[PDB]
Predict the structure of aspartokinase.
Amino acid sequence: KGITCVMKFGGSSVASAERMKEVADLILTFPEESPVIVLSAMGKTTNNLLLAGEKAVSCGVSNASEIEELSIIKELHIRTVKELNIDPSVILTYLEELEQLLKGIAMMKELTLRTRDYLVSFGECLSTRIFAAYLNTIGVKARQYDAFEIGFITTDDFTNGDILEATYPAVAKRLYDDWMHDPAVPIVTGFLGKGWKTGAVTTLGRGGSDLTATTIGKALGLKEIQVWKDVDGVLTCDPTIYKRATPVPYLTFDEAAELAYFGAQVLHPQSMRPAREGEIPVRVKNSYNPKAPGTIITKTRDMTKSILTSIVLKRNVTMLDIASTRMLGQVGFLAKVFSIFEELGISVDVVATSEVSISLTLDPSKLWSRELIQQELDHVVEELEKIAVVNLLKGRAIISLIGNVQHSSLILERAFHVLYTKGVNVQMISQGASKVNISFIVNEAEAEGCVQALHKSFFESGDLSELLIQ
Amino acid sequence: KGITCVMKFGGSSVASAERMKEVADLILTFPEESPVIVLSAMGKTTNNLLLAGEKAVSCGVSNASEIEELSIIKELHIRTVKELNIDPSVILTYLEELEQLLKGIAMMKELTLRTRDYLVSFGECLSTRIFAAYLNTIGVKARQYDAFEIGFITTDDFTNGDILEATYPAVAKRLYDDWMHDPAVPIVTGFLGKGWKTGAVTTLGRGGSDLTATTIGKALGLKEIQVWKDVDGVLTCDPTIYKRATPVPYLTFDEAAELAYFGAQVLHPQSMRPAREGEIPVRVKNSYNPKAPGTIITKTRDMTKSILTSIVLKRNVTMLDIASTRMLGQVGFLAKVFSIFEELGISVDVVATSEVSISLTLDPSKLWSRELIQQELDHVVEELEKIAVVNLLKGRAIISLIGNVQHSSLILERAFHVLYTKGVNVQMISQGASKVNISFIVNEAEAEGCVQALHKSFFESGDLSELLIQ
Ligand SMILES: C[S@@+](CC[C@H](N)C(=O)[O-])C[C@H]1O[C@@H](n2cnc3c(N)ncnc32)[C@H](O)[C@@H]1O
Ligand SMILES: C[S@@+](CC[C@H](N)C(=O)[O-])C[C@H]1O[C@@H](n2cnc3c(N)ncnc32)[C@H](O)[C@@H]1O
Ligand SMILES: N[C@@H](CCCC[NH3+])C(=O)O
Ligand SMILES: N[C@@H](CCCC[NH3+])C(=O)O
Ligand SMILES: N[C@@H](CCCC[NH3+])C(=O)O
Ligand SMILES: N[C@@H](CCCC[NH3+])C(=O)O
């Protein structure tokens, strides 16, 4: 019969040899299944590599081997080899290479996007190699795969490699030929690709390893794509904010796009496209409860019992207000406003309007590498102040209500009633054409309290059917 | 002993000799007041002039004398002169010219924005001259003023002439030299100005005659600027839609900027600026109820007991939905989207977003000269369809809630409760940073019934003092 499913594992699932032992244990929980494993770098080593890169640019040549992130990375992997009882030879070569590259960066005081992609590639290259070797140690015939060396073909822009159509038949042929010759559990690298023109190593951008998994899924026409987490799938809210988060058994690919990336930390909208096209359900599973259903994401689901699906919190968002009387009935003000943002390399999140104003939220900082500094903020405001009365408000927060659009008025009446009870007034509201997501801009300090109250009202007040029938 | 105030009158107020008689009666109602009168063109002549322009472009030379709109404008003014019993000479010369200008357009088959401004200038030029002559007929010493001849100094962009700072000193000086020499009631053309470097006749764009009134106000430092209508000021909604519309006694310049243009048909936001910076209250009065207060627009007002201010309806709007998985975390998607619109000469109104979509609504057609034709839409969609999945939805409507931002949640709980009762789901919601204006996108067919319901709940349910206190 052959290959059955793809299993994707994030950084923290393989943060140590001990965690790696859990993953291996999962594979052996389903021997009636023949999976493809997709691994990220060992928890936090991807971030560590990038930090090492930036540090290298300006530390000096004679002390690139001293960069802390380098010895953090070196030691994690040496130690993981020891603990799992692997031949350290292969990993030691890759680590010496890593140090060499950083000596290169330090010498040149230069770090291009092309180099950045190469740097991070060590991460999952080390990951998959350690894990594959370990499986062979414990009797599991396994083969490690560098995505960029099988059929993963992308464009040649680096931080954001776009998967090209020729990937699907190339990957399918490569993984199939190897499996039929002699079957071994494929252990494939995360957010990596080859790139058409340069041949250089590429990262898949946002929704990295998830995209790798979904791509494999479509290429091999598998029955489902599985994404593993430490909680029971997608939850009604973030358990960090409020302990009473409950699992959400069924999602729609559409609902997921509005939810899974900021609600869970998985399945960026771009990653689910190969699964939407191939019509392959995506499942989010708990590695601490692997026999449980989790969350299936499909094209459609039974909405009969559906009122609210989940609550989402964005924290510490910067809001801008852009007011001008000239706006009303003028062509090209919106074009000018967002052009300024594009010129200054800033991505904007939420947008709302009035007759004489446009209001903004900038992407949450956690979506990027750094918070914007006062310089960069004073720069947008000055540029904007040429055409409008501008006003900047730091320390705000977004609450997103993801629910069944057929009961929007029901949702909103209840929601604002709750906020009214607490004396909370939403500063900014934005919902698009019958979209499942509606955003409230609130103060950072009152956000958690609001989320908890909203959760109590929607998910802890029993079955919500006051719903008008006959 | 000095000019005391400026009174502005719209087209319908001077649509005929009979309506003009009402205006003169208003002037004589306040002999203890010395007004400056700002007149629009005789109801619908402005539109008729523009219509005559378009027709001239392609009817042929011999036929220009027979343009329907030209025949209408000729007889209205000839007949008005007849009834007011004035010397027809001045008017007859101006009508000769008008026919000559159209004969020119007809020959050349070209209508520039420069000509367009000259064409419409005849409206107020006729209007003011008839009224001025009539006042002198009945014992009211009066002097007609062409705005472009008294120091309304403007930029040389035609459809949208911008008032330049040199206007205030020039106008105050010209209007005072004439009044001190011998006092007469000034009758000024409303929609007009003179280009700085062309010396050519200019129209003030949106804001129109209202702007002329407020400009004169600031220039002469008067106590108030009065805008005349046929109803008791600004109402709680449009009486055309629901009979129970009630006067809104007090308004804020900010509230007015979100309300007056679409709620009433007066005071475009750009027209209130000279009154804002000059710190002069604007009053909206009823010509059928002249001793009544109406609506005073001031910097600030007593917000105690203020909950909802007014409900606004925008009929027949076109909504667009623009969805892409790529925009989440991308710089410049908003910049491109609205660039397309700018390149296609279209002004967008309401905007909202989701994690992977941006939705928007196009300026209501009444704000323009024509509705967008099916071809023009298909081009917007095609252009947008290159970067996203696009959906066009005709036959929607906007309900705008203008209220007290301090009771946002209260207002919203109630509103959505009403909508839920009716079984209505809002398709798109948009409120900017603590703005008084929140917009719902609804279906055109259900809109009117919704407005009535909302009005019943907010303005007819008695005193709405159930606020959280101790
Ligand atoms: C603002 S531009 C940098 C300035 C300039 N364009 C350049 O490249 O030299 C991007 C930087 O700001 C950070 N950043 C923080 N918030 C951002 C946002 N909302 N959109 C874009 N970049 C953001 C990113 O991590 C990145 O380091
Ligand atoms: C949209 S452009 C016409 C498109 C044409 N291809 C061009 O570039 O000149 C302006 C015309 O469309 C009409 N129009 C209707 N709705 C409009 C809107 N929302 N924004 C701009 N123009 C609009 C105006 O009356 C005006 O006559
Ligand atoms: N795969 C790397 C970078 C993030 C990719 C997101 N799937 C890691 O988690 O260490
Ligand atoms: N490209 C857009 C991204 C946001 C799209 C709407 N959620 C920007 O520059 O901010
Ligand atoms: N004079 C025209 C237009 C004035 C400007 C209106 N915005 C009228 O009769 O209303
Ligand atoms: N300049 C904007 C006008 C609308 C601004 C938002 N209310 C446009 O091009 O559509």
Notes: Residues 1-42+140-301 of chain A form a domain with the Carbamate kinase fold (CATH 3.40.1160.10). DSSP finds 13 helices and 16 strands in chain A. The pocket of lysine (ligand 6) is lined by residues A 327, 330-334, 353, 358; B 341, 347-349 (CB under 6 Å).
